[PDB]
Amino acid sequence: DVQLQESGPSLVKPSQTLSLTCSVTGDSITSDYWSWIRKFPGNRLEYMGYVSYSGSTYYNPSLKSRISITRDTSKNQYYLDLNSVTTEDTATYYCANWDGDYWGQGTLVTVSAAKTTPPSVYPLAPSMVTLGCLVKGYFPEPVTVTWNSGSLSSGVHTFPAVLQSDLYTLSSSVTVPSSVTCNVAHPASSTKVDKKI
Amino acid sequence: DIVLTQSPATLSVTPGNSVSLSCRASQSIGNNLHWYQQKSHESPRLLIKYASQSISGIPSRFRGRGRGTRFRLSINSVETEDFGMYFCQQSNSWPYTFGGGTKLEIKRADAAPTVSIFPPSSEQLTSGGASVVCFLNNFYPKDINVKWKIDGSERQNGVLNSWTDQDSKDSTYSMSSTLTLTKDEYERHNSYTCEATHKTSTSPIVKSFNRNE
Amino acid sequence: KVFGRCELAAAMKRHGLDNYRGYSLGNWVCAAKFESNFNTQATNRNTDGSTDYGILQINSRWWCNDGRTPGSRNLCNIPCSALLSSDITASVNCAKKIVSDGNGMNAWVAWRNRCKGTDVQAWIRGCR
Numbered sequence: 001d002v003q004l005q006e007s008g009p010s011l012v013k014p015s016q017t018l019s020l021t022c023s024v025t026g027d028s029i030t031s032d033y034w035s036w037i038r039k040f041p042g043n044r045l046e047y048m049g050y051v052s053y054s055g056s057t058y059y060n061p062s063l064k065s066r067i068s069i070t071r072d073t074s075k076n077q078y079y080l081d082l083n084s085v086t087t088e089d090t091a092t093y094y095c096a097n098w099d100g101d102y103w104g105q106g107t108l109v110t111v112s113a114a115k116t117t118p119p120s121v122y123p124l125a126p127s128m129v130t131l132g133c134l135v136k137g138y139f140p141e142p143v144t145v146t147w148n149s150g151s152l153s154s155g156v157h158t159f160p161a162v163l164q165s166d167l168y169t170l171s172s173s174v175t176v177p178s179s180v181t182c183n184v185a186h187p188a189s190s191t192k193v194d195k196k197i
Numbered sequence: 198d199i200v201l202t203q204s205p206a207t208l209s210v211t212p213g214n215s216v217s218l219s220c221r222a223s224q225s226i227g228n229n230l231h232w233y234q235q236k237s238h239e240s241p242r243l244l245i246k247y248a249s250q251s252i253s254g255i256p257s258r259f260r261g262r263g264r265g266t267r268f269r270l271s272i273n274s275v276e277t278e279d280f281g282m283y284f285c286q287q288s289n290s291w292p293y294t295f296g297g298g299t300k301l302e303i304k305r306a307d308a309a310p311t312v313s314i315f316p317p318s319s320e321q322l323t324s325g326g327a328s329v330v331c332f333l334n335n336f337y338p339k340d341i342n343v344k345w346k347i348d349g350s351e352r353q354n355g356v357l358n359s360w361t362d363q364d365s366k367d368s369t370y371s372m373s374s375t376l377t378l379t380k381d382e383y384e385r386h387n388s389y390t391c392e393a394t395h396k397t398s399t400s401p402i403v404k405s406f407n408r409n410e
Numbered sequence: 411k412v413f414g415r416c417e418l419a420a421a422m423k424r425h426g427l428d429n430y431r432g433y434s435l436g437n438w439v440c441a442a443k444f445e446s447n448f449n450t451q452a453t454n455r456n457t458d459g460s461t462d463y464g465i466l467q468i469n470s471r472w473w474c475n476d477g478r479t480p481g482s483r484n485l486c487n488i489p490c491s492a493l494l495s496s497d498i499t500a501s502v503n504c505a506k507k508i509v510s511d512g513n514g515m516n517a518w519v520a521w522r523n524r525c526k527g528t529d530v531q532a533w534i535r536g537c538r
Contacts, residue, residue, distance in 0.1 A: 031483050033507070045241075045284060045295040053472070053485055056512025060292045061198070094240060098507065099487055100231065100286075101252075103240035124315040124330055132315055132330060134375070154366070157334055159359040159373040169357060171373040173313070173332045227426025229506075247426065247503065264426070288506070289430055 002026040004104035006095050010188045011140040012085055012111050020080040022095030022104060029076055033098035036069060036080045038091040039106075046091075050098050051078065085111050110140040114166050118189040119143060123182065125197045128175055133182035133195065135161075135170040143186045145172045152176065199223050199287050203296035210275050211304045218270040218299045220263070220285035229289035230268045232261060236281040237362050245270060277303050280363045305368045309397035310336035314404040317383060327383030329406060331391035333372040335364070342394040344401075345376040348386045352376065411496040413448035413465070415439060416537035418498075425502040431509055436530030437521065438505070442466055443533070444520030450501075451494050464493035464501045466518065473504055 008020040022034065035050035049059040049069050059067045068081040082089065090111045096103040117139040124132030135143055145158050155175035161168040172182065184193045200223035210216050220230060232245035243252055245261035248268050260271040272279055280303045285296040310333040317327045333341065341360075345352055355377040361370060374391065387409045393402040413421070419439050422428070428435040445467040446452035454462040460471040460479045468486070470479040476490035486507050492500035508517050515521045 028483075032485065032487065033510070043282060043298050045286075047286075047293040047295065052511035053483070054512050058291050058512075062292075096240075098510070100233075100241075100246075101243050106240060120321075122318040122321045122326075122328075124318065126313075126315065130311070130313040130332060130334070132313075132332060134318070134321075134328065134330060136321075136328070157332070157361060157364075157371045159361060159371070162357050162359050164357065169375065171330060171332070171359065171375065173334060173371070173373070175334070225429075227428060227430065228424070229426050229430065250499070264424075288510075289426065291431070 002032070002097070002102045004095055004097075004102055006093060006104045006107035008093075008107055008109065010108060010110060010142070011114075011116060012109060014086055014111055014113055016085060018080070018082040018085050018089065018109060018111075020093055020095070020107065020109075021077055022079070023075075023077050025076070029071060029073060029078060032102075034069075034071075034078050035096055035098055036093065037096060038093045040088075040091045048080070048082075052098075087111050108142050112140065114139055116140065116188050117167060118191045119184060119186050119193070121182070121184050121193040121195050123195045123197060124171075127178065129178055130173055130175050131180055131197055132174065133172045133184065135172070135184050137167040137169065138186055138189075139167055140188050141168055143168075143170065143184060145170065145185075146183045147172075147174045148181050149183060152180070198292055199226060199290050199294050201285055201287060201294055201296040203283075203285055203299050205299060206297065207300045207302065209302045209304050212277055213274055215271065215273040216275055216301070218272075218283055220268045220270070220296050222266045222268070222287060224290075225265050226287045226289035228264050229287055230261075230263065231286045231288065232259075232270045233284045233286065234279075234281050235284065237365070241284065272301075275301075275303070277305075277368055279303070280368065303363060303368050305337045307397050308335055308337045308367070308369050310334065310341065310372070310393055310395055310402060312391060312393055312402055312404040314389070314391045314406050316389070316406050316408075322380055322383070325379050327378040327380045329376045329378075329383075329389050329391075331374040331376075331404065333374070333393055335367060335369045335371060336395060336397070337369045338396055339370050340396060341370075341372060343372070343374045344392045344394075345374070346390045346392060347376075347378075348388045349390070411450045413442075413450070415443075415448075415533060418442060418448050418465070419534045419537045421498055422502070425498065427502060427506070430506055431514070433509060433515055434530060436533045437515060437525055438466075439533040440525035440528070440530045441515065441518045441521040444524045445518060450496050450498065453494070461490065463490045464495075465498055466501050466505050468493055468501065468504050468508070473508060 005023045036048040066083040071078045119138035122134040158172040161170040230248040233241040249261040283299040313332045315330040357375045360372045389406040473486045474490040475484040486504035
């Protein structure tokens with residue numbers, strides 16, 4: 001068994017270098033071939049590259065001149081370096097094994113010159129009763145919104161965020177018995193806000 | 198560089214029927230085609246490897262067929278849990294390439310939206326706030342239309358909409374609509390109406406927030 | 411099971427090894443011949459204390475786990491029993507991984523010594 005975790009910036013500036021890290025737990029990185037794949041906003045998947053047992057690294061010709069895949073046996077990790085990034089390199093990045101059966105969770109990377117913005121959190125209250133939480137005016141994406149630290153999750157609907165020029169606005173609904181806290185986290189600004197009804 | 202084109206791009210199926218998904222290659226790739234399933238909130242899931250080989254645990258209703266330049270993934274007696282995107286990948290030549298995807302949508306019985314309207318929060322109103330939220334939850338089919346009319350009179354300039362995909366519990370969709378105003382504008386008018394047009398209703402579904410009342 | 415030239419060739423073309431990462435079928439037929447003599451149950455023990463298993467004599471210190479090579483890297487993530495079957499499925503998928511490294515078919519000593527630089531199509535000429 002192997003567990004994979006991607007780690008890296010959510011906002012990178014254009015013309016600069018993207019760096020990512022795939023941490024591997026459970027088994028050594030000497031037990032497989034390891035690869036990087038990205039999914040662009042249009043749901044288009046691109047195999048970025050893989051590293052083999054001999055240390056041979058294979059790179060997509062499209063990115064060959066700007067990509068480097070490196071390894072660290074000391075830390076059981078491998079790394080991705082993409083140089084000269086542009087706004088078209090904004091995507092979700094996945095590390096995975098060459099077999100393609102063990103994948104990471106994904107790390108969203110936005111390439112923009114826009115500035116990081118913390119979110120404003122507002123409560124939404126008026127058979128069953130529905131409450132809500134508005135996360136307005138933030139950058140970049142993503143944010144994570146849970147209800148009562150995830151205990152209330154079956155009746156939760158967090159809506160994908162919509163962009164307004166330079167800021168994102170998101171809504172989340174929770175349905176609860178007649179018979180409650182909204183927890184919002186923005187990693188890129190390191191903000192953690194809890195709001196009740 | 199092998200080009201993979203997948204077809205159709207979107208298909209809707211009544212649970213219990215069989216579907217076939219096609220992946221075509223720009224050059225012969227033998228049997229080196231793999232099929233993946235990606236649902237919402239999930240990393241790609243390998244379903245078929247080397248284009249007919251099964252994967253432990255994956256239902257036998259998934260079948261792989263094909264060799265050369267034309268391949269196919271068959272889902273017999275499609276079930277509700279098979280909604281998602283479907284990708285094909287080749288491994289015969291480097292760079293390893295993917296297909297464009299096929300979104301599978303599960304047909305369901307019609308469901309009326311559960312509409313809930315929420316006034317601007319006092320915390321928001323302290324700033325140039327005044328953003329009324331409407332939640333239209335758990336509805337099928339996807340076809341929906343929302344109009345905001347503040348005092349009886351439609352406004353569509355400050356409206357922002359977002360929608361979820363099929364849910365992992367009831368196979369329905371959900372929607373959020375937000376009318377953003379200024380606190381001035383909000384205080385000057387009184388009524389706030391959220392109107393929905395769905396197949397489940399014969400006249401608009403209205404939920405209103407009356408400041409006066 | 412022991413394979414024939416044309417039989418192995420056909421099976422390896424049905425398993426999509428013809429031009430996998432550029433290597434024609436003949437390369438694989440040649441390698442299999444000089445590695446196991448088309449024997450699906452061929453086993454060879456090495457100095458490491460490892461075993462070579464199957465039609466393509468795949469090592470247990472690097473590519474498969476037998477429970478008898480400690481410190482195996484199991485790069486093909488498979489048991490070594492599957493390489494000893496009359497079905498060549500596992501041997502083929504593993505060799506596809508072995509060849510997808512930068513060394514290529516230079517991981518098979520036989521291939522390096524007896525097939526590299528030769529008309530390997532001769533090992534499929536005659537088969538239909």
